[PDB]
């Protein structure tokens, strides 16, 4: 591993 | 637009209803929420000018916390011309004397303070129930179990019902716990504990008029991925901490008092060892939750915590143990940072290094959190943004605050827009990372947020309720909400319209959280519809149900003087008495509680004690009591312990240890009782 | 005359205890001792009440202690 | 004769620091540097001392790791106070304080406290 | 002085100091009964002996042999000790023992020191009866081992104090430890007063009261007290102790000067300079507040002068 | 401030027994001067009037 | 509200007239010993009072 796995740069705010 | 706030039509209607009949006031957040209470208090202000002896009534404003009590006190001082007093335990209220206590009751027409202070005040006959006019209970939801509100209002059963003042159930939320199942019976119990029914908004234009103050903010879900793999260093620090835990369980510090469970069934480690174990366990929790860089910040905080504890420690063994803990904290920090820095050779720009480690030495939770920050407050007006961060634990506040400071300095865009701040409730922690032995910034965090100095407030369930704050622009709920009332008040914190209310949840745990969200929404809708359709013009409980709601507990003992020994306060009274007995710093010792074994219980109390618990108490040797009081057999450990405390307090009162006001006798009282016997001849010279 | 004032193994049993237990060691209350007990140190007389005052102090303290304990 | 104003404040602080140090025998910061940053104190030692310390910490010619640890620490002029600490453990619980401009005390058994400081230095300098 | 305690008791009710009771005439007050249920004489001796290990060694060091050991158990039980359920703490017995010891000491010094004047007489009385002298006596006779107590702080202080006394040979000297300038060599003379535990003196006084209550012969109690205090009785008469600030101020040739207290953190620094054997000497005292620092500086000064006389 | 020249010498006369107290007072004064200067350097206000 | 110079250029310009002096301390051997004549005058003055 050695790293924290990255995430997307374009998540959104979802009406819930 | 007037300096004097104008009472509204709906507010006046509610005040008139409360004048006709007491009850619970359920209103959304706003200044009018307290304005209605101020108006009700002003309504019954006729008898304030008259003296207490002539029947001149007074106003009592009982509160849950000191801060909101201060807020209500200053509000009623600014909105009314009546004399109002502020009374919290930290002001030294108890050392006051009957004479000046009475003349300050005369001076201050309105009394505001915490629940316990007023409970003690009424139990000690400083004010009679007939001497009060209105008793306001803000945060009405806090009437759970043996909370001071509930026992105080149980105390109403003693005096004549005709003398009882008007109670006002001010609240912003009705459900307190996760009691969604059959909300109707819970609110029925609440409105029997309180002596009036709930009143709220029902008409459409009534709701709009409330919206003249209150708002209906929206909520948005933000979700992040999770993964179970962990780094090698995580395991290395884990193993080192476990070895230190072993060496600490085998530390063998000096003799310490025996610590046992709440039910006295099992033993516990000494407080000195439990404290450091708690510190390290919380550090591991922060490490696994918020990333390794967050772990570096948490370990930095542990450095100053161990430094101050070592500085203030006295026993040489405790000194050495703290020194070892700090040394291992340094070693753990060194392994962490050396792992960080060997990877931190691809780039050397400290801004870029800080951003890279915040992006990649951190869990996806913090990554998505900071991404929400950057997409929300990239280059906006710093005055425009005003947001709260809600976290679980106290140390999470410092961890997040430091990480966000370092990210603000690691973000040129966010460099000057965001001003973070943290504060936590009791068990307060040194709010720094540098062991700054002296600071002059006397302005508190709440004042900084109120004046706009800090546009971000990071807190662990301390800003969620009671505190007076502006209409916050946004709210970030970092950790999942555990309780209905917590969710309601958190969503109420984003009191501005078109606000952003974020629920940070895992991608893999969407279903349970969303079902919880529908459960809370269903509970709120059930509360609304119940308050709409369910109504009775009786509006007040009957005598039989009033007594039924409180006949379960042990009857309190009342003297002809008028004082009442509350069974739930028996332990507090007894432990206060044991505090005052020793005349030496090393002589202090708490009573030795004990639970009798079944064979012992039988051979002492016959077969009648079968199926019931018994708790014995042995007084400290220096005390005059040495009779080993035995509690009455009761169903559970807590009931038996309360009964033992109550019986011991009754015995102490009988043997003259208590002054018939159930407080331990002071030295002045003893010497005054002896004055006539031994110092009577001073009278002829006009002295005593 | 009080020359003490500047302006001019078997333990030995205490005399006070000896005359407390027995009656044959009793001594009369001297006139000069009473006069010394009356003569304050403010007056320039050759004797003062201080030395008797110490023993009176200890006796009074002991008797008050025993009375309170009883 | 005349005396300068700063050299005397440097002496009053020396007074109080000396009293603090003699009173408890430690817990007074002689690094005097950034409170976070004193963690790097061992990393900032002189290159030749660190070089010989690393040579000894990776050495195996020393037939036991005890005198190995002594050589590694003596490369840095350290002074150990190995002492027994009262414990419920059958095997005695041992204490060691290394002394520096910084305070470092380690807990382990006599069977592994020397290893527990060897790997400590290994962490510090690598 | 002329009619003994039996008769002397009556003038208190004559002076209306106390109030007479029908059952308790004042002349019988020497027959002090330890009444009440705080004390229980029904306990078998083996239960007390369970607490009282090395009983014979303690009686040998004390010089008295008890015939009712329960009083000894009351005197040895510090109030922090929870597992004693048959007696009260030593506070009750210490209260009586203080008066008993003070009265007997005053009577002895009155009888045997008519030469030395009243002011120095009361100075000697105060110096001999004070807490620290009783604590040093308790240490010197190894009585501290038998104190029944459960408290880390008190035990730590007792151990430190007994180690200091052993380093001093159990003599009653100035209670000060010098840190710099065997003390290590340095450049600055620094000193701090030694902390004395009140428990040692209080338990010794309660033990004296227990001896009285067991024997009822005041002469026996005086025998024990003299056997304990004989070396310090012999030493104090030659040089009456006075508070060290005055002892240095009143000194013939020291001529001390005391600096203003300097505060840094919570420790307080006071310096004292004095001539000594044609050489000027400056010593620095530290304490939790100004007066303790001044006491430590004065004590260090007195130690320096006493050793410089030779 | 009265010593208005280059290479002005400002002399204080203090007793040996009062030296350390005077030193603490003087450095407390210097710290106060530095902190008030820093406060005026740092503070930002909007109205510039009470 | 207080106004003051704040620029570093203003800082280095203020030295034009704000020249500060080097401050130094002289210690003297404090001693209480004095000849009897001062005590004699003290006695005369108190008697006259």
Automatic annotation (TrEMBL), chain D:
Q: Where is the signal peptide?
A: none
* Record-level GO BP terms: defense response to virus; follicle cell of egg chamber stalk formation; regulation of regulatory ncRNA processing; RISC complex assembly; siRNA processing
Cellular component annotations (GO), alphabetically ordered:
cytoplasm; nucleus; RISC complex; RISC-loading complex
> Could you state a single Gene Ontology molecular function term?
siRNA binding
Query: Which sequence ranges are marked TM in the entry?
Result: none
Q: Which domain of life is it from?
A: Eukaryota
Q: Which UniProt keywords apply?
A: RNA-binding
- Record-given protein name: LD06392p
Residue numbers of the full-length protein present here: 186 to 311 of 311
